[PDB]
Every structure is written in structure tokens, then in C-alpha cells.
Design a protein around this nucleic acid. Structure first.
Lengths: 200, 148, 52, 203, 98, 53
RNA sequence: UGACCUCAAAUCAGGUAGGACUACCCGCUGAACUUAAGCAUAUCAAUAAGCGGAGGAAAAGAAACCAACAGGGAUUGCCUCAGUAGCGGCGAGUGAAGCGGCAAAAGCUCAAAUUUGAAAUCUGGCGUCUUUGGCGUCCGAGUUGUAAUUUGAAGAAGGUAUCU
RNA sequence: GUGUAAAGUUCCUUCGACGAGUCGAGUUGUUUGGGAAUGCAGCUCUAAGUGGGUGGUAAAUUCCAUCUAAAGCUAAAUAUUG
């Protein structure tokens, strides 16, 4: 049951796995029918675009801080800045997220500029709008028209400024300070009451 | 292909290559890793030392995103410089104007100090550097800028 | 069983290698004759016709 | 409104007043049938919270459920298995008595839709519940835009499928890391995790 | 700024320009109101006290703060809820000594 | 109420506000929520409570 | 002689439930063979059998969420995370989630508020019309609360500049 | 079209009701990757109003972050030996 110099395997096939085998023979058929659904939906609502405009947000965690991606909806503050009521905004292809807030200014400004770029190109029809004017429009892809773009990483040339303390020393000192913050605070405090009670 | 297998060559020979005495059976020795401490001990000791027992402390709910910190050495640091401006940068660079290398935007956590740099000032941006890596960078007239 | 392997993956670059090699072979008369085509009354290969 | 006073008073279940009222009502309910029809909610505020409205087509049924665990119904306690499965006593039903009350009431009044239920009283042998049911064939329900949803056939015996509040509580349908096994149904999650997914171009 | 600007240490992280946020209304959930205080004082007049609340008051009357705290933690379940319970009993006694 | 409604319809037809034709009502306030709200606002002058609720 | 409350009766007027199917779905209940080269925890398996309940899908679903970041943002599925953290006679075995890429994207409703200058609400009967219903009228339901107004993303009551 | 209607939009003031034998705790059983206890259920105890829950090692002290339970509806993407 255990022979030769081989890796030890974890093959989890001790249950009735043969009754739950899902083979995706319909991958091509699903692709084609997905395209047909997409075409029907696009043709139903033309020239109004198929996608709602989405914001741009920072990916969470220390691993994905660098990347920026498409969010769910513009916050109520971002819509407040461009003067669109959220109830109204949902009707003109702008997605809304009541849950997100803006602690920083960079994301808020980027999404405000995104909303302004969208609002500039928006043409809202009405009863007086006739079939010829509507016919003169093309159904765009909102996501491609307003793509989420990564901010440019720093490159080029800059002047060199060398601090006295090395970066390695800076990191070591920061680690040490964080490690001993609590014990140093406790020591300093108890010394404070010791020298403020016996010196009374 | 089934036609190139040895099953097609074993046709006509009684035991199909399994021997007449041994008599290929269901599971002599047990199933899986059975008997690893009893009758397969001689195999586990020889080829998989350290298999049995506990070492170290548990870590409940380990999130691997915290420990994300890909390494880049100094011998590979100039690849992060734009390819078409590398030769121009390598020639005219000076303390008044040196290329800036943001290692974080390229997906790296720590700058390590293996290899030798071109004798050219650079401005390196990293979340972390090793002691020797930063000594080598300042030795060519550069600097390390810590970012977050 | 249906979960037998039916499709096979080929590296994209290798597939393009083969496409280019076959396109090159289409211009060799000995290969076209060996392939089995009646191309003895075509003066030269490749055979290019006007866009009409 | 008096509903705020009712709501705050019903929380003082160990006060003299509520202890007396519970004694009297527990006796009175124990005298009647196991399932009987209540002319009106004994806790009108609690009924309002759970969606009851004083309209024709809303019905209240009081039911009495036996307390305690679930003795394993095997003859003479012999289980015929491994010693880990030999337990007969100290076993517990996986649905609350609230769900059992709703299921039995829904079985009795088979033409109604169980809307919800609530606790009314308690003694050593019985818990007492009041179940709010809706008649889906009454026009006052069929013409009410706030309750038309229950007329749709997906809500046939929603209490027998665990779709009431008590049933969704017992199924572990909640958000977060504490409900990883049961966010989207325990058996659905298990099936998803025990399925071998093979694609055309195997990876 | 509000971050150290480096990847380690106390208050680590990238500096950003903090934007003032208007607090969500849902954060006001635990706030008390005139309506609920007035109703709760009336119900307390009508309801009275639970049997364990009466027993707690006697322990506090007998200078048994340590005794009262243990009974409340046994009854209520947690130490945090017991500490609040013992206090509103101290206020109850303080409002019945006049 | 139907008779008052007819009179107010005639008044609003002739161009009056339907408030200037009917005097302000002085009636018994009933209903539990309504009467509790009146008590809490110190608007009630007398309360009668049934003994068999 | 009358209301009210509770409980009945009727071949009362008009309705409704049950049973069938089984591939998928929502629950409950629930093994053992098997593996561990024995076997009792474990494994098989939170499976088979058994019971209850549906639909064209069901379930879930607009955070008492994930996080610890420069933060994300209902639910579902895929790829990945990952045969990993972890669980385990720490043996045999077993084993998720966050992030990320994508498919699809859609949001909301009550209770808790005095209409109090007017129960403004609703089933039914009867009549009528142009009938998935409208209008009128009479009983009845309902103040132990049916409508309008608000749902935390808010919102209300006053005041406010006009606009859309 | 009954739009002297309804809805939204700015700012100010005062307010701003928000679900209990429930949360939570102990114990028992089952279950889970959940490990001084993941969920569920029984029994006993049983709240509060910036309170309550969560923050994967039990406890106390002090903060911070994040939601707002104990009421409800909702297409699509998904499954499909009938």
C-alpha cells in the first residue's frame, strides 16, 4: 500500500463521488446561448446601454492595495457632489451603493470625475424626442467607454535625497516601537504615579 | 492509446505479467497508507522522515494575504525599469535625476540584495528591504524610499 | 463513462507553428502531388487569382 | 399608542402582574383542545409585529406542544449499530417546538397559509404558541398588494419547508463566518463541495 | 498624516487625505429617546421587580456588593450585564431612601 | 356623515372651503391608541376605562 | 325586551385542502457494509433507505457581512484560494472561508407616530354596466385599529428659495 | 388628461418611535475545519438602550473597527437519469 520513493497523495475519492461528477459538455452551448441572451437583452433596450456605470474602488487587503477595480455603486456623497438624487440616478444607468462611504479624498474625487464624464455624454430623451434622433444613436458599451484604469506607477527621473538613517534602520525601529509600546506605556505610567504619589 | 500498452502484448501469457506465485490480489498490505507504523514503517522511515508527530504551534484562521511579500533581488531590479528607456537611463543617470523603480506597483514586497547593480544611481521604492540590499543601493549612489 | 477525456489541449504557439508549417507546405509541388491533388496543369505554386 | 406600553410590559415576564396573567391563561389554555381557534390575538402588539392585520382572512390558532427532547423511537432501546449510535435518551429534535406548532396547525387548517407564530405561555409539560395564518382564497387577501405574495404557489406549506422565521432559524440561514456550512442550505453547500467539476479541456 | 507612511510599526499604512464623513443614521440605534424613557418609567411603576431583582437589592442593602455581583452574574449570565444590573439596583435603592 | 358630506360638496361647489359651513365637532374620543396619545399630550379631560378588557 | 363576549348548528351562501409524477429543489429522520490490513472514537456519511413540502426552477438575497486595507459592499454560480488554515486512536483520513478574475446584476416592504376638523379602509348581498372588472346602495368586518404617511440608505413636524 | 395634485430638489431648527422567554449565559446531545466549544435543538437562568452582535484561545481592565438581530417580499446568472 506504501511502496518506493513516491510523494504521498491526498486523493479524496472515498465517498460515492461517481454520482456527483459534473462534466461541462455544454460549455460551447452555454457560451452560444449566453451570447444570444445578451443580444436579445441589448436589442430590447437600444440605444440605452446594457450596463450601468460602475465606480472605481481600491481592492481590500495588503496584497491587493495596489490594484484598483470596478465597484458596485457610487456612494450617496458622490452622487450628492454631481447633484443626482439616488432614486433618479438608478433610472439613468448610474449604479448606487448606499453601503459604501468615502473616508479618503482620492477615491471620492476619481468617482466624481467619472460621474462628470458620464453625465457630460448623457443625452436623456423625452416625449418630444422623435424616432430619427433616437435612431441616430448607437448602443455603446459603458464599461469599455469608461474603463477602469490603473493609476500610472511612478517612473521617470527624480532627484536623489539620501536620509541619514537607513530604511532598514527605520523599519527595525518601527518594529521595536510597536513591539514594546504597551510595556513602555505601562512602565512610564506606573513610574508616573510612583513619583506623583510619594512626592506629594 | 490502448494499442501501445503492454496489455496488448501480454495477451496469450497466462498471468498478464503479475506472476504465478504472487497471484495479483485485491489489496495485500492494506488500503492507502495502512500500516505506516506497523508493516510499512520500513518505507516511511527511509523515504518520508518526519511523517508522524506534531511540530510547532497552530494558527487559527490563517489568512495568507497577510504574509504576501514577493521577493525581488538587486540583480533583477533593472528589469522593472521600462525596457525602451533602460539604455538611456543607464547612461545619463545622476544624483540630480535617477530612474525611480516602484517595486510595489510591479507586485513585489521586499527588496533582497543578491547580485550586483550597474554603477548607476537609482531611487528604489519598496515596502521592505534587507540590510545588505539597501547598503548596495546606497553604494552606487542611490536611495531606498519606503512606501505603504 | 462520460467523464472520459474527449478534448485535448495543444499549446497555442505550437498550434500556430503547425498552421505556418502547413501553409508553407502548400507551396511545395512535390508535397501537393504527394497529398494527392491534380495540380500538374497548374503552372506554378502558390496559385493566386485576381480579386474578382 | 398603547402598543409601546404593551411591548414594554410583555418583557416583564417575572413581574407579579404578568406572573398572575400567565398562571390564569396557562390554566385556561390547558383546559381547551390541543389545537383550537382563537377569536383574537392574546398579544395584539406581538401579532402586529409579525404581520397580522385585523382584516377578514387573518386567522389565529392556539396550539399546545409537549416539551422536552426526542426519545429515539427504537423498540426496547436496541439500535443495532455501533456504540456511538446507541444513544436513546438525551437526544434532541433539530427543529424548535415553534416549528412543530406551526407544522401541526398548518396541517389542521390545510386551506390556509401559515404567516408566522409566537410564544404565548409555558408550563412544565407544554409550550403554548399562537399561529398567524392567512386565507389565500379570501378576496381581501387577493386584492391586498401587501399580501398578494403569499397567494403564489411557491408559498404552499412554507412552514413545512422551513421558510418561516423559526424554520429559517433552525436551518442556519444567516450571513457571516459563523454560518459557512449553511448560508445557502447545508445540503446544497455539501453537494457543491463534494462535486467533481470536469471541463472539456482538463486543467 | 494619520498613517505612519511605512509598512510596519504603530499606525502603519499609506497616508491619505482624510475626508469628513457624515455618520450613518443606523449608528444612532442605541440612543435613548423621550418616548422610550417615559414609557419605560410607567411600565416599571406597573410591573414592579423580578424575584431575583428583589433578592439583589437586599444583598446591596446588607453591604454585600461582592455577594450581589456574583448573584447577578449567575442570574444574567455575563459579567458585563451583571455590572449594569447591580448599578440600576443601586440607583433604585438610592431613589427609595428619601 | 353622508349628510355632512353632501352639504360640504354643495359648499365646495359654490366656492366655499367646506370648512366654513360645518362647525367644529365636539365628540367623544375613543380608540386605544388615540386615547393613549391624547393622555400623553395632556389633551384629555376625562377618561373612562372598561373593566372587562 | 335588548346589546356584548365565548362557544356551537345547519345538505346554510361562496370557496379551499387532499392524490399522482421524480431528474433537479427545501426540510426532517437516519444506517450498516466498507477503510483503519484486528477494532471500540473516526471513516463510509451529516450518505442509502424512511417521512413531509414545492417550482419551472427551488433555495438564498439587499448585511446584527467581510475585513484590519489607501478598505470592500444583497444573493447565486464558475476559475482560484486549496488538498491549504484547520480537524483527526494527530492514525487511517478529512477540510472550509476572506481576498482576486469572471457570469448575472435590482431593489425594497412592514411594526413601532393622533386622521382625530369627522374609518378617509375592506369581504359579501342586492341592482346595473361596456365584466380577470366599474358604479350605486344595504348589511357586515373593524377603534383590542382598517386606509393615507416613514423604514434607518433614513425620515417626521414646522420654516425656507424657486425650480424640475 | 380634474396634475390649484403628487414627487423630488437647498438650507435651518427641534426631534428621530426601530421587533423579548428574544439576545445572552450554563449544561446536555448532535453536528462542524471551527480547535476552553461552528451551527442547531432541549432544559435552567434571563437582559439592555449608545444599548446589542461580531472581530476564529478561555478571563478581567481599557479602547478601537464594523454592522443594527430577534418581522417580510424580490428577476438573472445556477441545477435538472422526470
Amino acid at each position: 500500500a506504501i511502496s518506493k520513493n513516491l510523494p504521498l497523495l491526498n486523493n479524496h475519492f472515498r465517498k460515492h463521488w461517481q454520482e456527483r461528477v459534473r462534466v461541462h459538455f455544454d460549455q460551447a452551448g452555454k457560451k452560444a446561448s449566453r451570447r444570444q441572451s445578451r443580444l436579445r437583452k441589448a436589442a430590447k433596450i437600444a440605444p440605452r446601454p446594457i450596463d450601468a456605470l460602475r465606480p472605481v474602488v481600491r481592492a481590500p487587503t495588503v496584497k491587493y492595495n495596489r490594484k484598483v477595480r470596478a465597484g458596485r455603486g457610487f456612494t450617496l456623497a458622490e452622487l450628492k457632489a454631481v447633484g443626482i438624487a439616488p432614486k433618479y440616478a438608478r433610472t439613468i444607468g448610474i449604479s448606487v451603493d448606499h453601503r459604501r462611504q468615502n473616508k479618503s479624498q482620492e477615491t471620492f474625487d476619481a468617482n466624481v470625475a467619472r460621474l462628470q464624464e458620464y453625465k457630460s455624454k448623457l443625452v436623456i430623451f423625452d416625449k418630444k424626442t422623435k424616432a430619427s434622433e433616437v435612431a441616430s444613436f448607437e448602443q455603446v458599451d459603458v464599461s469599455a467607454t469608461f474603463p477602469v484604469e490603473q493609476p500610472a506607477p511612478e517612473s521617470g527621473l527624480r532627484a536623489v535625497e539620501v536620509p541619514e538613517q537607513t530604511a532598514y534602520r527605520t523599519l527595525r525601529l518601527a518594529r521595536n516601537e510597536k513591539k514594546y509600546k504597551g510595556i513602555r506605556e505601562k512602565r512610564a505610567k506606573e513610574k508616573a504615579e510612583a513619583e506623583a504619589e510619594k512626592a506629594k | 492509446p490502448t494499442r501501445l500498452t503492454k496489455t496488448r502484448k501480454h495477451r496469450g501469457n497466462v498471468s498478464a505479467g503479475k506472476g504465478r506465485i504472487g497471484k495479483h490480489r485485491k489489496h495485500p498490505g492494506g488500503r492507502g497508507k495502512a500500516g505506516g507504523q506497523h508493516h510499512h514503517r520500513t518505507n516511511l522511515d527511509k523515504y518520508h522522515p518526519g511523517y508522524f508527530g506534531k511540530v510547532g504551534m497552530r494558527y487559527f484562521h490563517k489568512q495568507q494575504n497577510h504574509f504576501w511579500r514577493p521577493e525581488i533581488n538587486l540583480d533583477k531590479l533593472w528589469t522593472l525599469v521600462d525596457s525602451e528607456k533602460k539604455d538611456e537611463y543607464l547612461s545619463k543617470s545622476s544624483a540630480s535625476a535617477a530612474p525611480v523603480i516602484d517595486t510595489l506597483a510591479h507586485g513585489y514586497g521586499k527588496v533582497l540584495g543578491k547580485g550586483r547593480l550597474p554603477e548607476v544611481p537609482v531611487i528604489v521604492k519598496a515596502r521592505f528591504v534587507s540590510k545588505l540590499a539597501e547598503e548596495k543601493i546606497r553604494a552606487v549612489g542611490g536611495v531606498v524610499e519606503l512606501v505603504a | 463513462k462520460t467523464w472520459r477525456r474527449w478534448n485535448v489541449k495543444v499549446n497555442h504557439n505550437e498550434k500556430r507553428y503547425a498552421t505556418a508549417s502547413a501553409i508553407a507546405a502548400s507551396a511545395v509541388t512535390s508535397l501537393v502531388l504527394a497529398r494527392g491533388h491534380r495540380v500538374e496543369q497548374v503552372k506554378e505554386l502558390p496559385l493566386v487569382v485576381s480579386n474578382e | 399608542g398603547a402598543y409601546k406600553y404593551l411591548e414594554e410590559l410583555q418583557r416583564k415576564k417575572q413581574s407579579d402582574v404578568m406572573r398572575f396573567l400567565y398562571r390564569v391563561r396557562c390554566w385556561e389554555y390547558r383546559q381547551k383542545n390541543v389545537i383550537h381557534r382563537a377569536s383574537r390575538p392574546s398579544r395584539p402588539d406581538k401579532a402586529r409585529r409579525l404581520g397580522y392585520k385585523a382584516k377578514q382572512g387573518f386567522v389565529i390558532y392556539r396550539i399546545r406542544v409537549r416539551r422536552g427532547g426526542r426519545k429515539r423511537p427504537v423498540p426496547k432501546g436496541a439500535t443495532y449499530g455501533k456504540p456511538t449510535n446507541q444513544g436513546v435518551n438525551q437526544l434532541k429534535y433539530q427543529k424548535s417546538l415553534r416549528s412543530t406548532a406551526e407544522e401541526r396547525v398548518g396541517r389542521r387548517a390545510s386551506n390556509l397559509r401559515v404567516l408566522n407564530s409566537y410564544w404565548v405561555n409555558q408550563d412544565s409539560t407544554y409550550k403554548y404558541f399562537e399561529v398567524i395564518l392567512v386565507d389565500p382564497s379570501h378576496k381581501a387577501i387577493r386584492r391586498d398588494a401587501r399580501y398578494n405574495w403569499i397567494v403564489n404557489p411557491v408559498h404552499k406549506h412554507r412552514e413545512a419547508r422551513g421558510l418561516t422565521s423559526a424554520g429559517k432559524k433552525s436551518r442556519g440561514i444567516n450571513k457571516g463566518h459563523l454560518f459557512n456550512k449553511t448560508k445557502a442550505g447545508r445540503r446544497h453547500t455539501w453537494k457543491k463541495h463534494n462535486t467533481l467539476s470536469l471541463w472539456r479541456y482538463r486543467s | 498624516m494619520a498613517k505612519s507612511g511605512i509598512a510596519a510599526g504603530v499606525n502603519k499604512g499609506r497616508k491619505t487625505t482624510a475626508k469628513e464623513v457624515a455618520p450613518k443614521i443606523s449608528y444612532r440605534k442605541g440612543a435613548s429617546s423621550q418616548r422610550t424613557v417615559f414609557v419605560r418609567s410607567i411600565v416599571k411603576e406597573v410591573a414592579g421587580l423580578a424575584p431575583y431583582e428583589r433578592r439583589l437589592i437586599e444583598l446591596i442593602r446588607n453591604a454585600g456588593e461582592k455577594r450581589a455581583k456574583k448573584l447577578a452574574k449567575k442570574r444574567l449570565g455575563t459579567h458585563k450585564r451583571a455590572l449594569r444590573k447591580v448599578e440600576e439596583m443601586t440607583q433604585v435603592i438610592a431613589e427609595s431612601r428619601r | 356623515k353622508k349628510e355632512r358630506l353632501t352639504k360640504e360638496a354643495a359648499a365646495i361647489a359654490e366656492g366655499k372651503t367646506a370648512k366654513d359651513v360645518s362647525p367644529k365637532p365636539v365628540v367623544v374620543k375613543y380608540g386605544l391608541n388615540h386615547v393613549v396619545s391624547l393622555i400623553e399630550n395632556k389633551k384629555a379631560k376625562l377618561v373612562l376605562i372598561a373593566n372587562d378588557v
